[PDB]
Each structure stands twice: as structure tokens, then as C-alpha cells.
Structure 1
């Protein structure tokens, strides 16, 4: 089977099919070899390849298949055809990056409750209290959660914590010493300059855009 042509992927900025996040769409031109019955596409990280049968009208108009709900990130799509005798075209690859299924609104506000009145960006207490507003359009998506990452002065991540149903994280001094100073250097220590970034992620491939910090 001659490989299918025009195997290209066009993102869909705003996508919804039955009120769930829709990513872009991937399209291709039917193989020129006759008797092709269906075009099978292999998707990385998926057990079941996506199969769409051709049609008697395909010889003229290229077919398209839509991909919905996958998370933002890289996808490897492999396209190959079949023959009624089982003969198969050589696979066609398309390595691309995918946008989030539903671009979510950034966190409204993100601040530290325990902040010095004398100057901004100074926590006085031993434990850093981190709070932020509930994401808007929450009722649109059933289940959501936030991913928070902590970075050092010299840019080494310290912990990636996933929080669900709560918008007020409670960083502890005991964490900062025991779980972080030792893990990052192997010796007792304290990190004074901290850094925080948070994203709002839904489940069905829904991811916020632009991070959020203070």
C-alpha cells in the first residue's frame, strides 16, 4: 500500500464535544493503492490504535479523524493502511506537541498570608502559608486539582505537590529542612530564598496556561 499523504495535525483553539475538552485534529489523504479498507493510526502511550474505515468517496476527498481529551504535550502519531489481503503501508510518523484540551483560566491571586508589613515578599514565621483563589469556571469541569512546584535561589526544584479541593497550602519548616535540605545536599540546612509556581489542571487533558507565582 502506498503510504497516505498529507498526514498533518491542525490544533483546535476552542474545542468541545459533548462538554469535554477537544484537542486538535489530524488528517491524511487516502493511499493511492486500491482495495484499502481502513487506515490505522498508532498513538503513543495508547494500547488501542485509532482505526477509521475508508469510504467509496474517499478516492477524491481526504478523511480526517479527531483527537479529544489528551493532555497538553508531545504525541507520536503513526499512520499506516491495510489491504483486504492484510498488506500494510509503511508507517507514517508525525511528531508534534499538543495544546491542552481546555485552556483553563490562570489563578486569580497567589500570595503568602504570613508576609511582613514592613516590606513585601518577606515571610516572618517559621512556616510559609500559601493561599490562592479558587479557579473560576470550576463548575464547568467536575474534578480539578493544582500542581505546585518549589524552586531554590539557584533554580533546583524541591517538591512538586498536587493539591485537590483545597486552595490554602501550608508549607512547613520541618519539610524545608528534613525533606529538602538533605535531599538536595545531603546535609542539614535551611533554604531562605524560596520560589513557587502553580498551575490549575483538570483531568481530561485540561491544563492552565502561563503558570502563576508571586
Structure 2
């Protein structure tokens, strides 16, 4: 009864890469053992064991990693004798995941020996490893925003089609010294943070900061 699909909310701790979860009520037949819901893409159906029978409690089946598109589900109830119920078919426009994963290995290229909290080159090179969910959603970019020593925003730059970024001397020495302090200077102490975003897919679960 009441076979529905509920898309996952915008931002929540955990639930990385999770699409919406499917929910249904238990069959009024009391000798059902499990349910066999057959996703279109997957060759094998999900087998959900009915271990506790409360008629007014919703059973769930979450989807993790399935790309957005046309997904057709068919839900059946299986008895102890092996008899199957009439399938319940639901075709829903599956959404894109809205709880992405944190950028991994956000490290600074051209780092000082001995102590890593010190620069070595004039231009800091920002390298990060690919977010796992690139495959599922193609239209994803990274929002890299750089802060100051006094907790004041400096840059908000979008990086796309590349998993690295450099911070040119010209930028700091002229543009962001002049527009902010109206003078010539180079903020020596900086803070870099980055996350993943998409045109339709939403932000990463949390900020990835040095």
C-alpha cells in the first residue's frame, strides 16, 4: 500500500551520494516474508526482508549512486509458499544526489620542507583530488574561496574541467590589495577552502579547508 518515492533533502550530515528513498506500507497479507523491488537499471532486484510486522509502519528502500533519469520500479510481496503479489509499478524522474562528498586530499603544492605550514614559492599552487561522484553527475564544479589573515573574504573563484588552481602573485599584490586596503601589498597569511557544486546538484556535505 501507498508505494511512493521521496527525494532526499538539501543538506544533511552523512547521506553522501544518496538519492531519494522509496517507501511503502506492508501488505495486508500477514504471511509475506520479503519484498522484491526491481529497479530498471539494476539486473538484480532489492530484497527487503519483512522481520517486524506493524501495518501502520512504513518500510523503506534507499537509493545510493543511481544517476538521474527515468527509473521504473516494480514492487512485489512474496509469501512463504512462493506466490508473488501483483506488482506495483512506479516511474519517477529520479533526482541527482544533493548530499555530495567532501573534496579529498586538499593539499598545497610548493610547500616548505621541515614545516608544512610555510610557503616556498611566490605563487601558492592548490591541488585537490577528484570527488568520487564525478561519474554520476557530469555538470559539477568546485567553488574555491580564499580568505585572509583577519577573517575577511578575498576571492571567490569557480574551478571547472581542472582539479588544480594557482594563486598568481599579480592577483594578491595588486588586485586584492587595492580593492580592499586601497594600496599595494601581499597578504602573506591566507586561508583556502573549497567544495563541490553543480548546476542542479547541490553543495558538498561540508567545507574542505586547509
TM-score by length of 2: 0.56
Cα distance between partner residues in 2 of 1:200 and 1:212: 9
- Structure 1 residues 86 and 153: alpha-carbon distance in aligned structure 2, compared to 1, 3 A threshold: farther
Deviations 1:85-104 (A, max 9, x none): 99999999999999995110
Q: Is the 8 A contact 1:12 1:23 kept in 2?
A: yes
Q: What SS is found at the alignment partner of 1:43?
A: coil
Q: Which has the higher strand share?
A: 2
Say what the alpha-carbon RMSD is for the aligned residues.
11.4
1:12 Cα offset (Å): 3.1
Deviations 1:81-126 (A, max 9, x none): 9999999999999999999951101011101111001201111111
Aligned residues: 210
- Structure 1 residues 45 and 161: alpha-carbon distance in aligned structure 2, compared to 1, 3 A threshold: farther
1:13 Cα offset (Å): 4.5
Unaligned runs of 5+ in 2: none
Q: Is the 8 A contact 1:26 1:65 kept in 2?
A: yes
Q: Is the 8 A contact 1:15 1:21 kept in 2?
A: no
Cα distance between partner residues in 2 of 1:211 and 1:82: 45
Deviations 1:34-88 (A, max 9, x none): 9999999999999999999999999999999999999999999999999999999
